Design a protein around this nucleic acid. Structure first.
Ligand SMILES: [Mg+2]
Lengths: 106, 61, 153, 397
RNA sequence: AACGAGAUUCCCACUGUCCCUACCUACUAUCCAGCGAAACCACAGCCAAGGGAACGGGCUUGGCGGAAUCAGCGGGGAAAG
RNA sequence: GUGAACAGCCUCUGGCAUGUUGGAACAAUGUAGGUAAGGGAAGUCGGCAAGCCGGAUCCGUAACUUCGGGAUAAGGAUUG
RNA sequence: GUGGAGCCGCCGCAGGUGCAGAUCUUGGUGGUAGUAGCAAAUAUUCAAACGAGAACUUUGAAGGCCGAAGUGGAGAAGGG
């Protein structure tokens, strides 16, 4: 029932590999979802528009190899699903991924 | 909440294409009320429907 | 109307019927032979895991070409499948049977599914277009399904 | 009718049911003959193939055109941590074949043996042998436990040994012991059986079972290739380009009047993952791995009498798809059945041979531990950074 | 002579046409959710030898014969049109 | 825009949602697209199929002929 | 047992007088079979709104294609 928020590195280049040239960016978001439902553990995952653009910034067949995300477990309202937690997976841009590790943010 | 008619009438009265129309998607139920062209020219003036200007094709190089 | 095999004690039994509804006959027949004799709160929970593909439906009779899945080992079988349109039409009717039970003044904590049968409806047709100027039918095969629920005590 | 041009059979009918074999660990189909006069000894051993390198050795073979020169040979190395003997099985013979007489296991068995007896170790309560250990210590269960060795000694004629592998010593993610059952072919059965009660739950190294330049056999399960077509499963000739419906197929799969597809014809199915037994694989070296911490563990593998370096047989960068060898190992000339990280049972040969190619001594002069993860050209990291010099690696100090 | 999507033989260059095959890619095939035909069909379907309308799935004498099936396959059903 | 070009390829105005469905997997066999060491038609009824050659500039162009041709013959060099 | 308004025996009479086949006629239904298949022209993705319900609707953003002999903008014939 937490409301905590963490920020992660995902290398997409490892998690899509041998994926075709026209399925290469569309898989790259259903591997971000399978991360966030593994990590924050909830089936309800929302990502926002500024992270869709960051993966699709180089076409389908050229995925950026690695991205820096932050994940926000929150709760819902107004006759929600029988799960009441959801994650808003949103994007923090960075210039260099070297020595970057997953910190808990406040 | 079909907005096909308001999409069609706007490009007729803005003298543009259907492609270049309408940023600000928030006022949906307000502009879904307009079903005339006389109504649709009010939404232009109140700034809810814009022109969305022309894509760049620079002859610089 | 009148069903197949009136129950032995109609005071403490409930019933539903659905006629002429468009599913496939063969897949609905075999998701009903899975839940025969099964308690309602187990059947309502098992039918969710068919649509969520967590627990399958063994195809025992009409099994021509039906591929194999590992979830069919619980049923002692090899072949299995997860009909979700069929698992919703006789789950939307399994609510109707427990909707009729509380109008009859019956306890739903002990309702088991004694009798359930699926049999065919008249086939409604449309036509497809094959080589050399030929017509051949896409005949649809809907079904009449029909169920008795009984308290055990 | 009379093909006009004679060709031989494609494939051998001796290996016919090209089946996924029912075992991952290789079964010893037939153990070497045992005689009472010869000392008492084990006959097989479990190992895990790690990869291949090659070698440089001084050949010694009089008469050939190679004599007294250097030859490179392709060698595979198989990491074999020492086995632990756990149980003792006797076999009495019938006129219906051998039959298991009865088995006696060790007093306290290891934890990774017990992991072999479960398909779900996590959902378990680990209750195996909890009631069988108590009979070694309760005295009523103990004076009949010594009774079952005396009836073992009296009746059954061939006895074997249940041992397992120490999977704690390997870089694999497996941790289940591979539980084998191997035959002691020594003297008479009383000395053959007192030789196993003495060494229950005690380790048996590899150099005590095998020897240097002592030719053995490799038993394994082949490289599984999947469901592959006719011209790859049987190496049948492809059809010419013009062929309608298909190129890589066998054309005539039989005559008219036998009226049935014969067993002797080539067609598509599972290629690889089959049980095969190699014959006559020579051992080059029994190395021992990564000793004491008193001064240093000492890497010191692959350092022959001409090399004299602080090398170790694990190549520069670690073995591709295997890991980094810390144990006792066996190196074998030639290709060996299986992928890397695959169990394969080494075994003494049934047949006797002299043949002047077996029974010869070998002296290694070089083992390259160059990087296999590409075209390696250096061998030890000090030999690289002596040649390479300093880099941008420090850049502060 | 010129000109042939005309018939033919040889030579240079070129090459997986071949020696001798191998690997990669896309769409399938495969598995699933939904939707769903037609051809054909006496009954049906394991063999050998025999006799026979002279070449049997059935008959005779032998060999033998376990539920349900999935991917292929082209021997046969003297397969179908 | 490139270019000799209403060729091909890439964008703008203006359109569209991949052509009667999606999801997962990447086996055989295919259909289409490629590469190949050494040899170079030994394959085959047959060089079928595929591959070479290919633009332009400056050179240089045979037999034969109805004196028009052949002819971008052939063969060469250069290109940012 | 269903069913709900007509029907039968005997003596004579009269036929459009009795089916298993006709690659029979008309109608119905199976096995095959939940199988073949829903694969020509590169491609979709994120949020939101309406909704009982959204891979497919509308909208916003991103990514793409037709690329001026078009997947653009107007007509004749035809359709009504
Ligand atoms: Mg044997």
């Amino acid at each position: 029932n937490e409301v905590v928020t963490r920020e992660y590195t995902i290398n997409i280049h490892k998690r899509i590999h041998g994926v075709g040239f026209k399925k290469r960016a569309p898989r790259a978001l259903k591997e971000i979802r399978k991360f966030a439902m593994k990590e924050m553990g909830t089936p309800d995952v929302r990502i926002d528009t500024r992270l869709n653009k960051a993966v699709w910034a180089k076409g389908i067949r050229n995925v950026p190899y690695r991205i820096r995300v932050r994940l926000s477990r929150k709760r819902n309202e107004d006759e929600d699903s029988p799960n009441k937690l959801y994650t808003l997976v949103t994007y923090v841009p960075v210039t260099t991924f070297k020595n970057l590790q997953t910190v808990n943010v406040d | 909440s079909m907005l096909r008619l308001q999409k069609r009438l706007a490009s007729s009265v803005l003298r543009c294409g259907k492609k270049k129309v309408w940023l600000d998607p928030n006022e949906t139920n307000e502009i879904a009320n307009a079903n005339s062209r006389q109504q649709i020219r009010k939404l232009i003036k109140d700034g809810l429907i814009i022109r969305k200007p022309v894509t760049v094709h620079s002859r610089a190089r | 109307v009148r069903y197949s095999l009136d129950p032995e004690n109609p005071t403490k039994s409930c019933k539903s019927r659905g006629s002429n509804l468009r599913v496939h006959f063969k897949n609905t027949r075999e998701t009903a032979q899975a839940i025969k004799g099964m308690h309602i709160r187990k059947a309502t929970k098992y039918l969710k895991d068919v649509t969520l593909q967590k627990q399958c439906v063994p195809f025992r009779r009409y099994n021509g070409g039906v591929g194999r899945c590992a979830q069919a080992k619980q049923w002692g079988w090899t072949q299995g499948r997860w009909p979700k349109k069929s698992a919703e039409f006789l789950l939307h009717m399994l609510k109707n049977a427990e909707s009729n039970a509380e109008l009859k003044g019956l306890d739903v904590d002990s309702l088991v599914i004694e009798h359930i049968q699926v049999n065919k409806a008249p086939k409604m047709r449309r036509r497809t277009y094959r080589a050399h100027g030929r017509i051949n039918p896409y005949m649809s095969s809907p079904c009449h399904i029909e169920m008795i629920l009984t308290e055990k005590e | 009718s009379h093909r006009k041009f004679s060709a031989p059979r494609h494939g051998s009918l001796g290996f016919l049911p090209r089946k996924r074999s029912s075992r991952h660990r290789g079964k010893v189909k037939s153990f070497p003959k045992d005689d009472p006069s010869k000392p008492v000894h084990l006959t097989a051993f479990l190992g895990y193939k790690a990869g291949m390198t090659h070698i440089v050795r001084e050949v010694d073979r009089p008469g050939s055109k190679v004599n007294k020169k250097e030859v490179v040979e392709a060698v595979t190395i198989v990491e074999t941590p020492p086995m632990v003997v756990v149980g003792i099985v006797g076999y009495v013979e019938t006129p219906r074949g051998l039959r298991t007489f009865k088995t006696v296991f060790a007093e306290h068995i290891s934890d990774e043996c017990k992991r072999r007896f479960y398909k779900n170790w996590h959902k378990s309560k680990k209750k195996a042998f909890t009631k069988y250990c108590k009979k070694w210590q309760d005295e009523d269960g103990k004076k009949q436990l010594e009774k079952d060795f005396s009836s073992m000694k009296k009746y059954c004629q061939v006895i074997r040994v249940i041992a397992h592998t120490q999977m704690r010593l390997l870089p694999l993610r497996q941790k289940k012991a591979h539980l084998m059952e191997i035959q002691v072919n020594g003297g008479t059965v009383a000395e053959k059986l007192d030789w196993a009660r003495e060494r229950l739950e005690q380790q048996v190294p590899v150099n005590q079972v095998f020897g240097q330049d002592e030719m053995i056999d490799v038993i394994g399960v082949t490289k599984g290739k999947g469901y592959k077509g006719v011209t790859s499963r049987w190496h049948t000739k492809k059809l010419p380009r013009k062929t309608h419906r298909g190129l890589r197929k066998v054309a005539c799969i039989g005559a008219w009047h036998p009226a049935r597809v014969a067993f002797s014809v080539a067609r598509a199915g599972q290629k690889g993952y089959h049980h095969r037994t190699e014959i006559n694989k020579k051992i080059y070296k029994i190395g021992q791995g990564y000793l004491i911490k008193d001064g240093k563990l000492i890497k010191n593998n692959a350092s022959t009498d001409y090399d004299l370096s602080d090398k170790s047989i694990n190549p520069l960068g670690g073995f591709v798809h295997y890991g980094e060898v810390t144990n006792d190992f066996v190196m074998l000339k030639g290709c060996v059945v299986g992928t890397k990280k695959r169990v394969l049972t080494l075994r003494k040969s049934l047949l006797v041979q002299t043949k002047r190619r077996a029974l010869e001594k070998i002296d290694l002069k070089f083992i390259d531990t160059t990087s296999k993860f590409g075209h390696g050209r250096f061998q030890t990291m000090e030999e690289k950074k002596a040649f390479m010099g300093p880099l941008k690696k420090d850049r502060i100090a």
